[PDB]
Amino acid sequence: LLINRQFYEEELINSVVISQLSHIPEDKDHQVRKLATQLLVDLAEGCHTHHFNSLLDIIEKVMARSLSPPPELEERDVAAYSASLEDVKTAVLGLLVILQTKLYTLPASHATRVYEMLVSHIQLHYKHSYTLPIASSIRLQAFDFLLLLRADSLHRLGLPNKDGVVRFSPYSVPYSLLFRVLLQCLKQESDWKVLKLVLGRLPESLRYKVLIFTSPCSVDQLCSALCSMLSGPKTLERL
Amino acid sequence: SFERSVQLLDQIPSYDTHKIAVLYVGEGQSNSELAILSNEHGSYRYTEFLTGLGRLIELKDCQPDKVYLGGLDVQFTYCWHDDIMQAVFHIATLMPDKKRHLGNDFVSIVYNDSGEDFKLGTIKGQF
Amino acid sequence: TKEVEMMKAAYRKELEKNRSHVLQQTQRLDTSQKRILELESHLAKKDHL
Amino acid sequence: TKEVEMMKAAYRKELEKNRSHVLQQTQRLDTSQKRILELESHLAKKDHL
């Protein structure tokens, strides 16, 4: 694949789709890890409407696990089970990278769906209250990136950046999802670092008023949460 | 000599003294150092904020040396005022020694109206 | 008095709305540029390919 | 005299900035759109080849 950029994708895509649409629930890990990384980079490249089906494979990989169900492996295979889940860890990280790059392309539906799927995954992640350190790192990197999302033009122009002040991809992205997941963190989080990070990063983001003013916000809620966060020791039993 | 000393004592005001330089830079005027000063008719929002900035007294026969009359030449020169302290805004964009008049005010409020316009090193106002 | 506040308030409902409209057009002009850029890049890479 | 109608002159200045700025942006926006349209043809030819 990586060699044959000579318009040798479409056919190879139809040769790769047949070996990936069904592999997804493969037994062992290394397989699905490599396959993830593959799909990830191949679609960082690909823009031939095969973004979607391949991306669906990625979705299935996102669902592929939730947490450690069995308590019989605690101190026994917590290491082993986490080493397994490393697959979906890499999956979501490459998904994040795709969100970063793939955004600056004419068909916005792509990055739109990317951001939406990321939000949905992390939201349900809280909704089931995963516990493993893998989950922690996932929350960490996910939020660490997503908070960088900022606006320069006054409408829906969320723009992160690397090493540079900003880059632009205006072309349909809401924000309320972020408030949702943030309140979910404030009410469900059980680490310290996730909080410390999102808290410290919140203010500057709040300075970009137009974002909060764009999507349905009802900011008031969080302050109550904040008050709840402070008033009453309901919080401090969450580390 | 003693009578002269008593007079000089009268010459000094009883309330506190403050004078402050108000400037309006533009968007590209960042680090211009002349278009800053030579500017006129600042942005609408900057002009609004400026209106509600205490009270002003026109410089003429009506206003005595009682309040600070620095630069009797030309206008609105808004001047905050109460009994303990008194702050005059000695120069604005509306004002046009003058270059020294605003290069000597120890502190300045500046209306950004740009994107990352200013660093202190930009202004050539020593005071 | 209070006409001036209305005049300030009256101006507010004009300059702000007009400025937002101007910003939209600015964003629309900005797009086309980047698309020109990427299409030139594609032309180059494909001709070389 | 309300500071010689200062908030009446800026209003006029803001209107002048919007007029000329809007005209120039529309003049450019058209050229960029025409260029993008031109690119959408040379590229198709190249793909065919």
CB B80 within 8 A of CB B61: no
| Residue A72 burial class via C-beta count within 10 angstroms: exposed 0-12, middle 13-18, buried 19 and up | exposed
Crossing angle of the two packed helices B44-51 and C3-48, in degrees rounded to 10: 150
The C-alpha atoms of residue A133 and residue A90 are separated, in whole angstroms, by 14
Contacts of C10 in chain D (CB under 8 A): none
Q: Provide the resolution (angstroms).
A: 4.4
Residues 6+ apart with CB under 8 A from C9: none
Crossing angle of the two packed helices A193-207 and A176-188, in degrees rounded to 10: 150
D42 inside 8 A of chain C by CB: yes
* Residues written for chain C: 49
DSSP structure string for B22-80: EEE--SS-TT-SSTTTT--S--HHHHHHHHSSSB---SSSSS-TTS-----------EE
Contacts of C33 in chain D (CB under 8 A): 32
Out of C15, C25, C36, closest to residue D32 by CB: C36
Closest CA to A212 of A202, A224, A227: A202
The C-alpha atoms of residue C8 and residue C1 are separated, in whole angstroms, by 12
CA torsion angle for A181, A185, A187, A193 (degrees, to 10)?
-170
Residues 6+ apart with CB under 8 A from A64: A24, A25, A32, A87, A88
CB B89 within 8 A of CB B22: yes
- Total Cβ atoms within 10 A of residue A218: 9
- Solved using: cryo-EM
The C-alpha atoms of residue B36 and residue B124 are separated, in whole angstroms, by 11
The two three-digit tokens of residue A235, written as one number: 């919080």
Closest CA to B116 of B23, B34, B25, B30: B30
Write the CA distances from B12 to A91, A214, B9, B67, B88, integer angstroms. 76, 56, 6, 12, 16
The C-alpha atoms of residue D44 and residue B89 are separated, in whole angstroms, by 65
Instruction: Give the gap in angstroms from C-alpha C8 to the nearest C-alpha of chain B.
Output: 7
The C-alpha atoms of residue B29 and residue B26 are separated, in whole angstroms, by 5
DSSP structure string for A61-93: HHHT--S---GGGTTTTHHHHHHHHHHHHHHHH
CB B25 within 8 A of CB B39: yes
Where do we find the tokens 């300045």? B108
Measured between its terminal Cα atoms, the distance across chain B in Å is 34
Hey, what amino acid is at B3? E
